[PDB]
Design a protein around this ligand. Structure first.
Ligand SMILES: Nc1ncnc2c1ncn2[C@@H]1O[C@H](COP(=O)(O)OP(=O)(O)OP(=O)(O)O)[C@@H](O)[C@H]1O
Lengths: 304, 96, 258, 152
């Protein structure tokens, strides 16, 4: 299999387009990356019309020789790391599913499915409710729910890409000495980032984009998102990651997350209106008024 | 294009480059440039369509180089059509 | 069915001129329309700000991010669902009137046809928007259409009231343009009698205190100055926002300003 | 003033009214009867430069945080002085009352720096429980607004 997003349930062009690794290695958010991808597809010998067809209805001859075409061409563009081995499960005259696609469908089912304290309580209740929707999809009898999860995953990844290009083009990322800050205050569809998993998706997109950047640094990142209804920011701290294909000389116990201790230290000393109640200690909910001072304290906190 | 697009004051130079030999009438040149570059059409949920083109009107005294500006716009535009007065009909500007 | 849209002569309605000089459609074509809507702009600031915000939300992308939610919850349905509901309702139901509905409709027809006679006699010219038997059949059709929504097999007074209100909002409003002044032969003596009565009323009644319509009729008519058209003269004076106010169920006439 | 008093009293409509002038104002800032400031003299004298007293009654100050109430008065005392100076300059030199054009130029630059410093101090000390005595919005009869940022 390949490090491609939902290959067997979408086109080949879509799989190459919405991939974190390909986007990091080719910078598809601007025009140059799209032109480079078109040049690659032209060189490989696959017509642009054929690469946009559904996987089931794709040409048999092209599908048969995909491995050789990948092996002989992927090295020129630095994408030789997309080839790997995985696990594929098939049940009768139904169709093949890979483990990666299954976990993305499950995550999509988790994310979307189905006076401020009550507002937060209803959101948490819906998040609890989504658990049974994800639970039902593990049974072989309920395949329509798995298909629904696949569609939801496609839509969610499209939204993440759309937000990420806006973040990257306007230079919203601010490089402080200790960490890198990104606060999303205005824009469309900020109601998708009230869920921690969607913000983790966007953070994984940004970290993947930064890891392959020629700039050599390992600073942690802070991602903040506003909810108008609750007037609260949801703030998450994300650890840096080494490049995927880098050697094992640096390999060790991975970089440690130090945001929990810093958040507890700042919360204890000052009477900030923060909520640290999630299982993940790196995700907090801070009132709108306290965001700008609190972060300043974090700048002097250290351990980051 | 991408090199000269990041210079500050590109809009001023673009406006100044419209009909260079005509003197003055900078508001007309700004309107012509805005019409030439154009807006963005929109469709909201596939049921509500919003136009994205700018139309311009020039009402003025005789001898103020309006027709020469129209000829310049005809020359610069990728697709241009010209008509005048009584030489056009109801179905000559429409489908017949 | 026919859905038509048009503009008046001169572009805007030009409320200063007569309705007959504004609508170029003849009586023959205007009698085949069940509902006629005359649309005007009022240029209010609050409405302008609300519309501006609504339009800007459409352009900035905030529209869809809201609409889906309501379409999801309980308040809106998609185009295809509404299409299927329309076809199911049209192919399944065809309601009928009740004996009380006919009685309520006949009286409304008599009222709306009487009013036209007074309007035409006062304006001494024929009405541009006509009221005929087709206007009764239109209200019957609207009542049955309202009944069709609920798949009800009978139309009752609940639907009749809403049909009557819709007809009043659509066609009776267009017919009753109520010209403030046309300077025509109608109310020709009133061209001076209006100013005469205004002066006589403003000299009798200082900026405070009130009077009654009963007295303002009896005493000012004992001198034989009655014109039978003074009902709207008080409202016209009220339109100045200073001369006249009506209070206490319309009995009390209060002088409020210059 | 005497001519106006005589003219008003001469009219038969107001023959029995009692009119007395209480104060003369040189520069007056009027919002309502409870919010005003300026420079006034009780009565004008002869051959002596008129003594002027400066008054400032601002109920608007009462709804501010204790740390900013002195600043409100201090900055109003600079606004009034600058306006008086520019009015004197305009009088000496000779649609718009040109006596008061350009008074803001004298106190703009200090005000910007003071606002920046106050904002920095607020960011530093707003979350400190020791300084909780400051930055407390008072509750007064007739107060309705629910507001968040004291320096704003
Ligand atoms: N700055 C200028 N203003 C006006 N006319 C100018 C100027 N510079 C040059 N001209 C010349 O003046 C002449 C008058 O222009 P033109 O014929 O377009 O006038 P017009 O009254 O707008 O025309 P028309 O009636 O055909 O629309 C042209 O030959 C034009 O080239």
């Amino acid at each position: 299999d390949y490090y491609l997003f939902l290959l067997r349930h979408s086109s080949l062009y879509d799989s190459f387009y919405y991939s974190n690794y390909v986007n990091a290695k080719l910078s598809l958010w601007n025009e140059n990356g799209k032109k480079r991808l078109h040049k690659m597809f032209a060189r490989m010998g696959i017509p642009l019309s054929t690469a946009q067809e559904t996987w089931l209805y794709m040409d048999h001859s092209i599908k048969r020789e995909l491995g050789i075409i990948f092996d002989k061409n992927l090295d020129r563009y630095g994408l030789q790391d997309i080839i790997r081995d995985g696990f594929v499960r098939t049940l009768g005259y139904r169709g093949s599913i890979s483990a990666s696609e299954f976990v993305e469908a499950l995550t999509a089912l988790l994310e979307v499915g189905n006076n401020s304290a009550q507002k937060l309580t209803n959101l948490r209740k819906r998040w609890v409710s989504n658990f049974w929707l994800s639970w039902d999809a593990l049974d072989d009898r309920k395949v329509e729910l798995l298909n629904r999860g696949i569609q939801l995953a496609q839509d969610l990844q499209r939204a993440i890409f759309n937000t990420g290009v806006a973040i990257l083009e306007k230079k919203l990322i601010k490089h402080l000495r200790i960490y890198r800050l990104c606060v999303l205050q205005d824009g469309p569809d900020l109601d998708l980032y009230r869920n921690p998993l969607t913000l983790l998706r966007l953070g994984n997109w940004l970290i993947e984009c930064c890891a392959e950047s020629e700039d050599k640094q390992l600073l942690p990142m802070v991602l903040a998102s506003i909810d108008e209804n609750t007037d609260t920011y949801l703030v998450a701290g994300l650890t840096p990651r080494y490049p995927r294909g880098l050697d094992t000389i640096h390999t060790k116990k991975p970089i440690l997350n130090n945001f929990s201790m810093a958040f507890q230290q700042i919360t204890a000393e000052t009477d900030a209106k923060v909520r640290i109640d999630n299982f993940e200690s790196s995700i907090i909910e801070i009132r709108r008024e306290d965001l700008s001072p609190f972060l300043e304290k974090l700048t002097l906190s250290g351990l980051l | 294009f991408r090199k000269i697009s990041r210079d500050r004051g590109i809009i001023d130079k673009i406006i100044s480059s419209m009909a260079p030999s005509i003197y003055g009438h900078r508001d007309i040149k700004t309107a012509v440039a805005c019409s030439l570059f154009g807006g963005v059409p929109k469709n909201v949920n596939g049921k509500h369509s919003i136009r994205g083109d700018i139309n311009v009107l020039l009402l003025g005294d005789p001898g103020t180089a309006k027709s020469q500006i129209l000829k310049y716009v005809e020359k610069t535009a990728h697709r241009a059509v010209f008509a005048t007065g009584q030489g056009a009909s109801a179905v000559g500007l429409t489908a017949s | 069915s026919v859905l038509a849209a048009a503009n008046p002569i001169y572009g805007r309605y030009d409320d200063l001129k007569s309705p007959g000089d504004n609508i170029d459609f003849q009586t023959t074509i205007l009698s085949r329309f069940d509902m006629i809507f005359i649309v005007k702009d009022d240029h209010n600031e609050e409405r302008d700000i609300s519309i501006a915000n609504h339009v800007i939300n459409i352009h900035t992308g905030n529209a869809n991010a809201m609409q889906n939610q309501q379409e999801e919850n309980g308040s809106e349905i998609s185009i295809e669902k509404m299409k299927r509901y329309i076809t199911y309702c049209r192919l399944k139901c065809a309601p009928r009137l009740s004996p009380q509905a006919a009685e309520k409709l006949s009286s409304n027809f008599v009222t709306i046809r009487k009013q036209l006679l007074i309007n035409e006699l006062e304006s001494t010219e024929r009405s541009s928007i006509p009221i005929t038997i087709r206007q009764l059949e239109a209200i019957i059709r609207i009542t049955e259409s309202l009944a069709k929504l609920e798949l009800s097999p009978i139309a009752q007074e609940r639907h009749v009231d809403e049909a009557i209100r819709l007809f009043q909002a659509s066609t009776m409003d267009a017919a009753s343009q109520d010209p403030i002044g046309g300077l025509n032969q109608a109310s020709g003596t009133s061209l001076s009698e209006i100013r005469r009565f205004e002066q006589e009323l403003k000299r009798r009644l200082p900026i405070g205190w009130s009077t009654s319509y009963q007295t303002l009729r009896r005493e000012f008519v004992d001198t034989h100055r009655f014109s039978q058209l003074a009902l709207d003269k008080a409202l016209y004076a009220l339109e100045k926002h200073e001369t006249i106010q009506l209070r206490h169920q319309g009995q009390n006439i209060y002088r409020s300003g210059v | 003033s005497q001519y106006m008093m005589k003219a008003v009293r001469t009219n038969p409509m107001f023959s029995y009214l009692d009119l007395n002038i209480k104060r003369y104002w040189d520069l007056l800032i009027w919002m309502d009867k409870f919010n005003f400031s300026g420079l006034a003299c009780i009565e004008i004298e002869e051959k002596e430069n008129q003594d002027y007293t400066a008054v400032s009654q601002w109920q608007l100050k009462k709804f501010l945080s204790p740390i900013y109430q002195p600043e409100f008065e201090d900055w109003m005392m600079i606004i009034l002085d600058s306006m008086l100076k520019t009015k004197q300059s305009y009088l000496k030199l000779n649609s718009v009352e040109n006596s008061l054009n350009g008074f803001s130029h004298l106190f703009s630059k200090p005000l910007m720096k003071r606002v920046k410093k106050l904002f920095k101090n607020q960011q530093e000390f707003i979350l400190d429980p020791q300084y909780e005595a400051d930055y407390v919005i008072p509750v007064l009869p007739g107060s309705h607004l629910n507001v968040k940022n004291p320096l704003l």
